[PDB]
Design a protein around this ligand. Structure first.
Ligand SMILES: CCCCCCCCCCCCCCCCCC(=O)OC[C@H](COP(=O)([O-])OCC[N+](C)(C)C)OC(=O)CCCCCCCCCCCCCCCCC
Ligand SMILES: CCCCCCCCCCCCCCCCCC(=O)OC[C@H](COP(=O)([O-])OCC[N+](C)(C)C)OC(=O)CCCCCCCCCCCCCCCCC
Ligand SMILES: CCCCCCCCCCCCCCCCCC(=O)OC[C@H](COP(=O)([O-])OCC[N+](C)(C)C)OC(=O)CCCCCCCCCCCCCCCCC
Ligand SMILES: CCCCCCCCCCCCCCCCCC(=O)OC[C@H](COP(=O)(O)OCCN)OC(=O)CCCCCCCCCCCCCCCCC
Ligand SMILES: CCCCCCCCCCCCCCCCCC(=O)OC[C@H](COP(=O)(O)OCCN)OC(=O)CCCCCCCCCCCCCCCCC
Ligand SMILES: CCCCCCCCCCCCCCCCCC(=O)OC[C@H](COP(=O)(O)OCCN)OC(=O)CCCCCCCCCCCCCCCCC
Ligand SMILES: CCCCCCCCCCCCCCCCCC(=O)OC[C@H](COP(=O)(O)OCCN)OC(=O)CCCCCCCCCCCCCCCCC
Ligand SMILES: CCCCCCCCCCCCCCCCCC(=O)OC[C@H](COP(=O)(O)OCCN)OC(=O)CCCCCCCCCCCCCCCCC
Ligand SMILES: CCCCCCCCCCC1=C(C)C(=O)C(OC)=C(OC)C1=O
Ligand code: SF4
Lengths: 105, 110, 42, 98, 70, 80, 169, 156, 312
């Protein structure tokens, strides 16, 4: 039983806290506002059964924005290869990745 | 970082003073004291009233926790709704106090 | 069906009300001067 | 995912198994229950502060208040237990086996 | 008479005057003869870290004015 | 309504002051003429950036410069 | 070491829960949950949740664990192998997790977890002249109307229920 | 020597702090309690000597036995005396605490409190005046001033 | 350099607590038609030094503790919380300038009852435990009106920033719009620190501590007294602040806080004690209804006057 009293009576009891793409105070965007807006506008109206297979790209984009697992795995690979080349002496860091370059602005 | 250093300094000063208080007069070689209370050995009687004032504290402190964002909530653009809900929270705290009154909850610690 | 394990179980009371199964005595002594024996009920 | 979520979830499961394996006391059970609530507070807070989802910042406070009220209820239940047997021992709560 | 309590109040008042005077002089000494930058908000921290980068001496308080533009 | 009020003010003046202050706190924002100015000041405080509009060709009331006459004015806030 | 500090606090956090999940005594359990609340508050403070961490102090510790220690001090009249065994068991489980995720930079107990410090996941912008957390909590009165109604009604009913079930009549 | 000078100055320091911060626990037994209450009154004012008014018996430094000690309360006197932290001193105030007094030949009176506790200062009178009790307290302070705890510790 | 600033905070706190004991004994002396200490030092100034040396060489009382660990931790927690209540205090600049210094102080004062509770349970006396439960219930009772009065006053401030509370009071002292909140605040902070007429720990919990640790509890309590007077001074009697001469603010708030601490000393030599139910009646049936009514008034009042303070 989902007695949709809110849509029937036209009141907004809890839809505002439901998603990150909703109206936030002082127009603060979430860090994955665009990804969630794209996933919601993809998966709207077509049902969950169609939405699990027809909006997989937007949902993988949004999940990887949220958790950043592919990003952190890529950073793990870059940093670990960098540490191996430092340990082998095949590589040196640049001066701008050591703190001796007087940052931009 | 300055705050963590300050907390560590205050804890270290307190522990140093407590160690001096618990170990400087131990070096006194005074005397061994042979055979070192209104109730003799009876058990502690449970007071229902102390527990009642503690739970009344806890519930009104939860209502305080709801009231704590009000200096930030006065800055909103939806001020009629904000003012209504603020007066409604303080009114429900007052209704909690009135019900605690009239059902003899504030008795012998009034 | 009473077994060996469920043999010490008696049926519950009929009104389902069980029997519940002392007040504090203080000695405010000499430590003018007066000794007091208090029977307090809280 | 992030590494601090590992420790907050594992803390929730530690306090779960503490709340799911009693020793004697009902108070130690309520302590494990409120440790579970605390770990939920920390975990929901780190998510909401992570994703910058602004409106859910009032969410853990609510998660505090209700559940803290819940704790009050449990404490009063414990006191009624301690107004029957003299202790809060969970092995005294076996009148309903028959 | 009643002015006999005043040496102890004077000692206690000097002991309360020391922390605020000391933190004011330390905030002037550690920040280039000025107040400590209050950064309660992330815009204020953004400006303060921009000052740290535009000074060239890795210090936010060393200010750069019209002499730094051409 | 008259003897009862003097009786409760004689016996329990703390509660009478409590319900009087709470009653003024309820009713007086609905009667105050300055309640509207609270709304108008809170909506005129620019926390965000005033993201400008693309001039399509017909916006007669949107300015091109902040010091232009058209647009929202806050002379009521300076003067009061 | 200092870039891992939240992680380090979180380790103390897990240790703190083994300080009372083994259940030594409800007063030592209360002390362990107080230290756990302090370090978990510090974790909340290090993502920028200052108000939420001060709710952990003012309401969880200074409000509620006060009442736990208060009620416990009115019981357990003042004067283990399983406790210390379970304590070292949970401690060795947690340090094996630490050692695995620090030697592999990846672990999977139930979910996959990264092994780098949790500073990496943060945002690189500013929030202007407001804390987003403070304004989302201030939103409780304008946007959070139904939530305030049901929370205040549940607290009023909580007062009524506590007075009913403790009266004995 | 050098260490003898050090223990001399440290004896002077600790005896100064012990005689200048006497905390009395006064047994208000009898009429001598009234005159101790006058030694605390504004004219004589024990508090200006560092002698506080009514310290608790577990943080007090000196036990003023002010009044008549009976047989029914002598174990309570000895209990309070044993519960005092050292250095503890005993001022016997008035004739009944000193030697039984006007109730010396009674069946129910301990003939002096010195049968029960070791007494340092015997303050004579019935009652001794608040000025005479203050004289006894200052004589106790002078007795503390010539203590040689660290000099005898250094010479043992 | 910051460590020097922490030392110049925490060492003068200890010195002012040490000489507050002399000021208490002198002011209670002259209000009782006698003198306070004037023999041990010149004008009594060496009385706290003599008394500290006396207490630190007195015999340890050596109790049978229920828990050794909490018996150690209760003075540690009391002194640590007594010292950390000073670091957001703006005078005119705090040691730790934070955005939520008010709420930080309310939190660290809410944590202060664990020292009372642990010292009461760590003693084997049941009487000391009953006294500790009474003192904890008293303190957590008056923390309610602390929180609500403090919220109602900070509705005129705009934030929980203590440094903003000086900017708030540059045209008027905040006691003029909020004197009923001020007087209930003042009595509630008088009831926080177990201070007369709310001192039922002296009327017939840490009596099993030796002279050293009891002196540490005593000095933590007087550090709380000086701190709550300074916090009341910043909160209701905000001084003039010239940013180019901060010592004007420092001399001014020091004079006001000394007068307010002497006002604590002047209350304790004027009134008898409440019975325990009488100050419970004072909180729950007198202070808390007016506190809620004035909280409604100070919510609705900046809206009806258009005087809502700035967020920043
Ligand atoms: C008892 C109820 C007391 C409060 C009544 C509603 C007060 C109010 O202003 O509500 C408007 C508020 C908010 O409306 P609003 O006017 O702020 O809407 C503008 C839109 N936003 C929020 C995005 C700025 O609530 C509602 O409209 C719906 C929720 C409450 C509806 C009534 C529930 C009664 C339950 C009885 C059981
Ligand atoms: C900073 C705040 C104030 C801190 C505390 C005050 C500052 C001074 C601290 C040191 C004071 C001297 C040592 C403690 C007092 C000892 C008094 C005492 O009872 O002495 C007899 C005791 C024991 O003497 P005893 O062996 O004759 O024993 C007396 C008891 N009978 C005979 C029954 C067994 O002496 C000591 O314990 C000596 C300890 C070292 C003294 C100092 C050495 C040099 C330090 C520089
Ligand atoms: C910050 C600087 C200092 C601030 C001022 C404080 C300094 C003075 C200190 C004096 C010594 C106090 C020692 C402790 C005393 C404790 C006892 C005590 O006082 O109890 C409080 C007493 C308690 O009541 P009671 O016990 O005296 O009276 C009997 C009460 N019954 C019947 C319930 C038994 O009074 C209060 O609670 C009053 C609190 C403050 C009231 C503020 C009211 C302001 C006016 C509002 C408006 C009124 C008009 C109506 C509306 C008009 C609208 C236009
Ligand atoms: C399988 C699922 C759990 C995996 C973790 C197990 C940890 C080690 C504990 C094993 C059980 C030990 C034991 O004897 O438990 C019984 C005890 C309650 O029994 P009690 O009557 O108090 O003691 C007499 C013993 N029958 O029970 C307890 O005291 C249990 C306390 C549990 C607290 C868990 C702490 C963290 C453990 C690691 C993370 C999970
Ligand atoms: C609508 C406005 C908002 C209202 C809600 C917000 C209130 C804010 C303040 C919080 C109050 C919380 C506590 C309320 C408890 C009320 C019940 C009560 O106290 O009844 C008992 C009392 C008599 O006291 P007694 O029981 O004898 O006490 C023993 C000691 N003698 O009985 C009495 O003293 C009688 C009390 C009832 C009559 C009070 C009348 C006051 C009128 C003031 C002027 C008009 C103000 C406008 C609002 C009127 C609302 C009725
Ligand atoms: C290597 C050799 C040295 C060894 C280490 C010692 C270092 C120095 C220690 C302090 C000085 C030691 C000497 C103590 C006093 C000796 C002389 C004396 O007793 O003088 C008596 C005089 C008052 O005379 P009185 O007998 O009281 O007369 C009653 C009124 N007609 O008394 C007075 O006028 C006042 C005496 C005051 C004593 C000194 C001040 C107090 C101690 C301060 C330092 C220690 C504490 C530091 C801070 C602790 C925490 C606050
Ligand atoms: C931020 C500011 C905080 C201020 C806190 C302190 C306030 C009060 C400061 C002290 C005021 C003066 C104190 C004088 C005490 C009495 C000294 C005295 O007269 O001692 C005499 C005694 C015996 O000497 P004798 O040679 O026998 O004399 C016979 C003469 N034919 O000889 C002795 O006892 C030996 C000498 C002892 C000297 C002790 C001096 C007092 C030390 C107190 C500690 C604080 C020091 C000041 C700190 C702030 C300033 C830097
Ligand atoms: C039984 C054990 C022993 C008992 C005695 C000792 C413990 C009890 C007494 C000490 C209590 C310590 C409280 C520590 C946190 C206090 C809250 C806090 O930090 O608030 C201040 C501030 C928020 O203000 P804000 O201005 O927003 O922050 C700056 C950015 N603008 O936030 C900041 O500035 C954040 C700074 C970075 C994060 C700091 C984290 C500190 C370390 C973790 C907590 C330490 C205490 C753990 C144990 C507590 C036991 C009660
Ligand atoms: C080393 C820094 C100071 C350590 C603490 C000792 C001095 C302050 C407390 C001593 C004290 C004084 C002066 C005091 O006057 C007093 O009586 C009211 C006490 O007992 C209740 C005290 O404990
Ligand atoms: S010595 Fe005399 S005056 Fe003194 S208490 Fe005894 S009977 Fe009374």
């Amino acid at each position: 039983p989902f007695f949709d009293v809110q849509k029937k009576l036209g009141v907004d009891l809890d839809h505002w806290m439901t998603i990150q793409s909703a109206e936030q105070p002082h127009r603060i965007p979430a860090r994955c506002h665009a990804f969630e807006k794209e996933w919601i506008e993809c998966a709207h109206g077509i049902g969950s059964i169609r939405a699990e297979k027809e909006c997989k790209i937007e949902f993988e984009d949004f999940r990887e924005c949220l958790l950043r697992q592919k990003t952190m795995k890529r950073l793990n690979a870059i940093k670990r290869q960098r540490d191996k080349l430092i340990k082998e002496g095949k590589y040196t860091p640049p001066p701008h990745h050591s703190g001796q370059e007087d940052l931009r602005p | 970082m300055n705050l963590m250093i300050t907390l560590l300094t205050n804890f270290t000063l307190a522990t140093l003073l407590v160690t001096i208080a618990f170990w400087l007069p131990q070096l006194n070689v005074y005397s061994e004291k042979t055979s070192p209370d209104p109730m003799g050995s009876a058990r502690l009687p449970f007071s229902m009233k102390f527990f009642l004032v503690a739970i009344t504290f806890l519930l009104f402190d939860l209502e305080i926790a709801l009231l704590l964002p009000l200096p930030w909530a006065s800055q909103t653009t939806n001020l009629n709704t904000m003012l209504t809900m603020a007066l409604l929270l303080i009114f429900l705290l007052a209704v909690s106090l009135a019900y605690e009154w009239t059902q003899k909850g504030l008795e012998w610690t009034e | 069906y009473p077994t060996k394990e469920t043999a010490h179980w008696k049926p519950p009371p009929w009104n389902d009300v069980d029997p519940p199964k002392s007040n504090l005595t203080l000695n405010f002594g000499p430590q003018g001067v007066l000794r007091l024996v208090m029977e307090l009920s809280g | 995912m992030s590494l601090v979520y590992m420790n907050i979830m594992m803390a929730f499961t530690v306090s779960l198994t503490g709340l799911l394996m009693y020793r004697s006391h009902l108070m130690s059970s309520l302590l494990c229950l409120e440790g579970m609530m605390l770990s939920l507070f920390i975990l929901a807070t780190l998510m909401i502060l992570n994703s910058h989802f602004t409106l859910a910042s009032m969410m853990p406070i609510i998660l505090l208040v209700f559940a803290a009220c819940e704790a009050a209820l449990g404490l009063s239940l414990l006191v009624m237990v301690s107004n029957t047997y003299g202790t809060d021992y969970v092995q005294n709560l076996n009148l309903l086996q028959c | 008479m009643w002015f006999e309590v005043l040496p102890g109040i004077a000692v206690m008042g000097v002991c309360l005057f020391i922390p605020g005077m000391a933190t004011a002089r330390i905030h002037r000494f550690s920040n280039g003869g000025r107040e400590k930058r209050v950064a309660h908000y992330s815009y204020q921290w953004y400006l303060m870290e921009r000052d740290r980068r535009v000074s060239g001496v890795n210090r936010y308080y060393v200010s750069k004015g019209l002499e730094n533009i051409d | 309504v008259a003897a009862f009020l003097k009786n409760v003010w004689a016996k329990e003046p703390v509660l009478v002051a409590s319900f009087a202050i709470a009653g003024l706190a309820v009713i007086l924002p609905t009667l105050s003429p300055y309640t509207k100015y609270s709304l108008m000041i809170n909506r005129a405080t620019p926390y965000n950036y005033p993201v400008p509009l693309r001039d399509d060709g017909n916006m007669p009331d949107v300015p091109s410069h902040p010091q232009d006459p058209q647009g929202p004015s806050l002379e009521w806030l300076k003067r009061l | 070491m200092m870039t891992y500090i939240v992680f380090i606090l979180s380790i103390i956090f897990v240790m703190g829960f083994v300080g009372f999940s083994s259940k030594p005594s409800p007063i030592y359990g209360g002390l362990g949950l107080i230290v756990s609340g302090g370090v978990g508050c510090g974790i909340v403070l290090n993502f920028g949740g200052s108000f939420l961490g001060l709710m952990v102090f003012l309401i969880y510790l200074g409000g509620m664990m006060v009442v736990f220690g208060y009620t416990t001090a009115m019981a357990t009249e003042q004067y283990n192998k399983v406790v210390l065994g379970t304590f070292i068991t949970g401690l060795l489980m947690e340090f094996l997790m630490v050692y695995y995720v620090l030697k592999d930079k990846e672990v999977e107990i139930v979910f996959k977890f990264n092994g780098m410090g949790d500073w990496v996941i943060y945002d690189t912008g500013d929030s202007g002249f407001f804390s987003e957390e403070a304004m989302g909590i201030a939103a409780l009165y304008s946007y959070g109307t139904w939530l305030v109604i049901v929370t205040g009604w549940s607290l009023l009913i909580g007062v009524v229920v506590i007075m009913e079930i403790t009266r004995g009549n | 020597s050098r260490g003898e000078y050090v223990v001399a100055k440290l004896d002077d320091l600790i005896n100064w702090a012990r005689r200048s911060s006497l905390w009395p626990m006064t047994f208000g037994l009898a009429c001598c309690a009234v005159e101790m209450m006058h030694m605390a009154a504004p004219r004589y004012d024990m508090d200006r000597f560092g002698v506080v008014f009514r310290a608790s018996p577990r943080q007090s430094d000196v036990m003023i036995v002010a009044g008549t000690l009976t047989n029914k309360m002598a174990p309570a006197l000895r209990k309070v005396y044993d519960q005092m932290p050292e250095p503890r001193y005993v001022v016997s105030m008035g004739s009944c605490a000193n030697g039984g007094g006007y109730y010396h030949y009674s069946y129910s009176v301990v003939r002096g409190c010195d049968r029960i506790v070791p007494v340092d200062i015997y303050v004579p009178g019935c009652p001794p005046t608040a000025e005479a009790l203050l004289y006894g307290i200052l004589q106790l302070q002078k007795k503390i001033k010539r203590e040689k705890r660290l000099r005898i510790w250094y010479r043992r | 350099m910051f460590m020097i600033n922490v030392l110049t905070l925490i060492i003068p706190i200890l010195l002012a607590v040490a000489f507050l004991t002399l000021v208490e004994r002198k002011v209670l002396g002259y209000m009782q038609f006698r003198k306070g200490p004037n023999v041990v030092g010149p004008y009594g100034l060496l009385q706290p030094i003599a008394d500290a040396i006396k207490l630190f060489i007195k015999e340890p009382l050596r109790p049978a503790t229920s828990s050794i660990s909490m018996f150690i931790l209760a003075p540690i927690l009391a002194l640590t919380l007594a010292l950390t209540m000073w670091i957001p205090l703006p005078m005119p600049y705090p040691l730790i300038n934070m955005n939520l210094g008010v709420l930080f102080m309310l939190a660290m004062s809410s944590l202060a009852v664990y020292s009372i509770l642990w010292s009461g349970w760590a003693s084997n006396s049941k009487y000391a435990l009953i006294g500790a439960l009474r003192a904890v219930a008293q303190t957590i009772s008056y923390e309610v009106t602390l929180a609500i009065i403090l919220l109602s006053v900070l509705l005129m401030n705009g934030s929980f920033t203590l440094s903003t509370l000086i900017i708030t009071q540059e045209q008027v002292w905040l006691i003029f719009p909020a004197w009923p909140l001020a007087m209930m605040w003042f009595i509630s902070t008088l009831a926080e620190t177990n201070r007369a007429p709310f001192d039922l720990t002296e009327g017939e919990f840490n009596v099993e501590y030796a002279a050293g640790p009891f002196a540490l509890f005593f000095m933590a309590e007087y550090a709380n007294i000086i701190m709550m007077n300074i916090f009341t001074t910043t909160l209701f009697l905000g001084a003039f602040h010239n940013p180019y001469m901060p010592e004007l603010y420092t001399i001014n708030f020091t004079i006001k806080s000394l007068l307010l601490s002497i006002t604590f000393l002047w209350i304790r030599a004027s009134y008898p004690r409440f019975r325990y139910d009488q100050l419970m009646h004072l909180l729950w049936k007198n202070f808390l209804p007016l506190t809620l009514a004035l909280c409604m008034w100070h919510v609705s009042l900046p809206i009806l006057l258009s005087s809502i303070p700035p967020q920043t």
